[model samples]
Target: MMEQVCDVFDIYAICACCKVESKNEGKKNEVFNNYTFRGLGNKGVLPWKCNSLDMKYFCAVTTYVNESKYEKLKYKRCKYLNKETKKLQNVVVMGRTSWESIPKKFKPLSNRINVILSRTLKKEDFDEDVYIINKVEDLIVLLGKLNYYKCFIIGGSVVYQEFLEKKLIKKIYFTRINSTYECDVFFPEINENEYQIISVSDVYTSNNTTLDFIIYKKTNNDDEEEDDFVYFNFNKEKEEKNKNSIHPNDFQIYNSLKYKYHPEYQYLNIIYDIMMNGNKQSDRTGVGVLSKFGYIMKFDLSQYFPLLTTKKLFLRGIIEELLWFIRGETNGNTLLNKNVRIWEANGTREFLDNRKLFHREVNDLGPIYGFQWRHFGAEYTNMYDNYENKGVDQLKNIINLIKNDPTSRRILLCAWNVKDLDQMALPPCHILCQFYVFDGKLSCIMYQRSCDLGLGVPFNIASYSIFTHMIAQVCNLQPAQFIHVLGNAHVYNNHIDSLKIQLNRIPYPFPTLKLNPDIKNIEDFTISDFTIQNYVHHEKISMDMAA
Candidate 1:
C-alpha cells in the first residue's frame, strides 16, 4: 500500500522551479503564484516585513460540531481549490490524523500542494516525498524559502487549538453548517470581540445540509515592530490609495450588496440611491442625514426574511420588541428587563422631561409603538391610568379582521395616535402599517414618518416581518410580502461610512424563521417560541443613534 504512493515533488520541484523562473524573471522566480497581494489588509506589505513570504493564514471549520470534532463532509468542494496555477499554488496543511481521516482516494487534495505536520514522519517515510515538517515555525521558514504567500490549515482539533494558542492565525473562513452530526472533535473558540467578519456568502445546500461562509480578520492598531517601514495594500501601480474610494456608481454599489435578488433588496437599494442623491437636512437628533421623501419598497415574504444581512443584526432584540408591542406594554422597562436597548434612549426620564409632559417615570415611555399597538386612541392620565377598555386595540382588531375577512383592505394598525402624539416619548417613526390578504396570503405595507436608515430601518424590517409572520400563523395564512412607504427615509451623517460599507457588502441569504405552530394567538408568542436560523452577515459596523 505504501509503495503505491511516491513523492513526485522532488523532480517536480526542479522542473517547477524552471517553469516558474521562465515566466517570472527578475522577480525571485516566483510564478504568478496566483497568490495575490490584494486582500488581507494588504498586509502583504505590512510595516513589519518578514522574508517576503507574508503568509496570511486562513482556516476553516464547520458551524455544526461535537465535543472535539466537526461533522464529516461526504463530498468535498472542488471549487474551493480551483485556482489559476497550473498545479496547486495554494497549499493545505493538516495533521497526520486529519491526513488519514480523508478518504484515501482524496488523501492529497488536488490542485494545491499537500503538506502534513508530523513530528514522527521523516522525508524518507513516504515514497511521495510529501512535504513533512515537524514544527509550525519550521514549516513557515521552509515556506519562506520557497516564497509561498499563504497556507490554509485543514485540521484536526489539535492543530486548530495549537495555531490559536500560538497566535499564528490571522483570518478564518468560517463555515456555518445547519446539519447536525455527532462527533468528538471541535474547532477552537474564536473571540468575536477580537476578530471582525469582513464578508459573508449566501447560504448553499449540499446533501440535505445547509451551509454559509464568512471571512473574519483580526483587527488591531498593529502592535508590531515595524519601526523602519510600513506597508499598505495600495500601490501606485494598481492605482490603490487610502482614500474613501467608493464604487464609481450606484449600480456597482447595488450589485455588490446583493447575495440573491431578494425583494427585500429593494429597501437597501432605495436607501443607497437616496444617500447618493437626496437632500441634506437637520432634525430632532441633530445628527442630520441625506433625506428623501415619498419612496416605497416591497418585499415578498415567501421569498426571504427581511432581516438586514449587510451587517450583523440582533434578532433577539427584534423579536422581543415585537412581543412587547403585541402585549400593549409601553413601560419600556420590560424590554430593558430583557436587555433590549432599542427603546432605552427615547424612553429615558430626561428625554421625556425635555419633551415636557414631565409626568412619565424612567422607562415609562408614554404612548409609544407598543402603547398604540394595543391601545390606540386611549386617552390616558399618567402611566398607572387604566384606560384598557377605552382605547381601540388596533392590533387585535386587525388580527380579527384578517381571520374573519381575508380580503378586507380595512385591516390596518395605526401607531401614530394623533391625539397621543404630544404625550409620547417619541412620535412614531413607524407610524402605520396596513395588512392586505390576497389569495390566502397575508401581506403588509408600512408608513414611516421618519427613518434612521442605518440603525432603525433594520429593526423595522425584522420587527414587522416577524409581526407579519405572527399574524399569518394565527390567521391560517402564509406571509407573502412587506412593503415600506417612506415619508422621510434618511441615513444619519454619523452612519454614512457604515451604511456605505453595508451597501458595498453582498447581503447573505436571509434567515429561516421558525415559529411555534401551536400558538394560535398573537399574544401567545414569546421570544423563546421563535427560532431564527442562518442569519449570516458581514461584521457589525456601528452607527450611533441621533439622540
Candidate 2:
C-alpha cells in the first residue's frame, strides 16, 4: 500500500557523516547495514555534522530531546520501511561534495541509490545509476519519478540550510557521535521551541565509536488545517512583555523582522485589535473573518510613504494600479498588459456577474473606484459606454477645490455610488477620500468601507499616500499626513498566523519616494516619474484572496 505523505509522518535513517579508518575488513558496512549512509569522508565526524552533534567515548549523539508527546510523529518507523519493501526505491539525497567526499571503498554504498545536487558537475561526471537534481524545488517536483518511499537529505551546509529556510523540511535525523574531533564544517541549530523531538536511538557501536540519534519535527505544523495557537491573552501587560522580549536592535542588520515602526506598526496594531477583540463574522466570501467595526490609523507622509515595512512589496505595480484607478479606466487589460496583476482577480467572468445577472462584456468591471471617481454621473451601461460629458468628476473637483480654495473642508472625493454597487465586479474597499491643505502641505483622510488587514490595507495606504502626493505636487504643495479610516477592519481567520508572523518581524527604515517636479497634473504622471529608493523589508507571506 502507498503510504500517505503527511507532515506528522517521519522516517529517519543514515544522518551522520563519519571519518573512520577501520582496519578490520570484515567489520566494513556493519554499522550502516540497517541504515542508509551518506557523507562518508576521511575527515571524520566533524565535516558534515550539525552543531548539536557531540562525541564522547566513540559514538555520536544528538542534543535534541522530546518534551511534548505527540502521536503524529513516527520516526521509529524507518527500520520497518525496508522490512516492508525489499525493492524500496528510497534514495539518499546530498550535495556533490558530500558524494565526492565519500571514501572510494564506500563511493557507491552497496544496495544504495544516491541523488546528488550539483551546479559544477556535468551529467556524465558519474557512471553510476545515482540520480542528480540541480535545485531543491525541482527535486521536490520530481520525487515521484523515482518512486522513492522516503528520501533523506544528508548534505553539505548549503543544502540543509536551503531546505530549512524554505520550511520544506519536516523531519531531521540528527545522529551525534560521543567522540569529539577537530572539524571545519558543522550542522545548523534546530530551535527546540519550534521543533520537537519525536524519536531517539540509544548508543550504538559503530567503527569502535558510540553514536545516538534523535528525530525532530517542526512544531505547530502537524496538519494543514490546524489553528496557530489555541488562545491569545489580550492583556496590555502581556503585549508589552512580548514586545520587550524581542530584541530592539535586531533590524539594524539585514533579513530581520522583529519589531515594527511607523505605518507598518500601525497596521500590526489594527491586526492585534481584530485578533484579540473582533467578533466572528461571516462575509460575502464564505470564509469567515475576525472582524471589527471602525478603526483609524495615521501615517505621516513626510516621515514615510506608508508602504508596509513588515513584508516586501512591489511598489511599482501599486503605483501603476493607482494610476489606472486615477485614469478613470474601467478595464484591467491595461494593468495586466503592464504586468500589474493586482486588479486582475476582480475582473474575471465570475466577478463580472453580468452574463449571469444581465450578461455584460467579457472583462467589464462595473463602475468601480475609477469609474465612479472620473465619471460619477455617467450612465452605467458597460465598459464601452461614453462618459465624455456625462459624470461629475469628483477627483478633478476635489483637486480644483484644493488649488482654488485651500481652506475648503468640502474638498472630498467619493466612489460609493449605491446604485452601481450591484453591478460592480467588486466594490471599492476604500470608498471615499477627503483632502485637507495647510502650511503648504497636503493631508488627506480616506474612508475604506472594508479593510483586509493582512493584505489590502497596506496596498490601500500606499495607493492613497501616492494619490495624496500626486495631487500635492500638482497643487505645488508638500505631502504631509495620510490617515486611513476603516469601516469594516477584519483579519481573516486563516490569516491570523500570517499576521503573527508579520508581528514578529523587525521593520526597516521607510523608503524615500521622488516624483518629477515638471509634472503638474495627476493625470500626466507616468510610472517612470516615481522613483522609490532604500526601502528594506522582510520576506513576503502569502495571504489568500477573499474574492
Top model by TM-score, which number? 1
Predicted candidate 1 versus true structure: per-residue lDDT over 355-405, tens digit per residue: 996777887888778778777776766555675776788878888888888
Instruction: List candidate 2 segments past 4 Å from native.
Output: 1-261, 354-356, 544-547
True lDDT of residue 450, candidate 2? 84
CA error at residue 332 for candidate 2, angstroms: 2.3
Candidate no. 1 TM-score: 0.56
Over 4 Å off, model 1:
1-260, 544-547
Error of 1 at 497 (Å): 1.4
